[PDB]
Design a protein around this ligand. Structure first.
Ligand SMILES: *[C@@H]1O[C@H](CO)[C@@H](O[C@@H]2O[C@H](CO)[C@@H](O)[C@H](O)[C@H]2NC(C)=O)[C@H](O)[C@H]1NC(C)=O
Ligand SMILES: *[C@@H]1O[C@H](CO)[C@@H](O)[C@H](O)[C@H]1NC(C)=O
Lengths: 48, 97
């Protein structure tokens, strides 16, 4: 969240893993950038 | 000396020009302290190739000979930079090449 622009980068890859983050290399492409102008200090994830 | 605070306009089409109803839109805007989510329209014009020109792509101003490139840029990229960190290529933003 830089100068009020909220930037998101992301990647999807298919995997086959039990219980850890995989030892690999990937770059996140930018998908969206939203000029929201708000201060951010905390976050929380939303689960089903 | 109790008065109801509101009254309604007697807007009749026979009213003298002035006692006639005249609509208003205040384009109010509060300006220039935060990132920009609205702008006036930025015009654009047809593409020339193999000629020397003063270019501008998406606000990238410069001067040069434009040519059809064989470079393939992934969809999130727009400017090409050389070993020198300098712009050597650009995506046309209307007819993506
Ligand atoms: C901007 O609009 C033009 C059409 O007005 C789009 O370009 C067209 O693309 C198709 C497929 O290549 C061509 O058959 C048409 O001749 C093109 N139109 C013109 C006038 O050259 C273009 O896709 C639009 N911009 C974006 C980003 O999609
Ligand atoms: C963010 O914090 C700064 C400094 O405390 C303040 O001036 C600004 O108004 C705040 N912005 C928002 C959107 O709350």
């Amino acid at each position: 969240n830089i100068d009020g622009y909220f930037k998101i980068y992301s990647k999807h890859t298919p995997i086959n893993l039990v219980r850890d983050l995989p030892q690999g290399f990937s770059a996140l492409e930018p998908l969206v950038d939203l000029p929201i102008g708000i201060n951010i200090t905390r976050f929380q994830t939303l689960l089903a | 000396n109790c008065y109801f605070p509101l009254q309604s306009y007697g807007f009749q089409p026979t009213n003298g020009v002035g006692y006639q109803p005249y609509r208003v839109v205040v384009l109010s805007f509060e300006l220039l302290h935060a990132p920009a989510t609205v702008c006036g329209p930025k015009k654009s014009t047809n593409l020339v190739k193999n000629k020397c020109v003063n270019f501008n792509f998406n606000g990238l101003t410069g001067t040069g000979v434009l040519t059809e490139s064989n470079k393939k840029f992934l969809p999130f990229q727009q400017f090409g930079r050389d070993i020198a960190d300098t712009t050597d290529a650009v995506r046309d933003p209307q007819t993506l090449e």
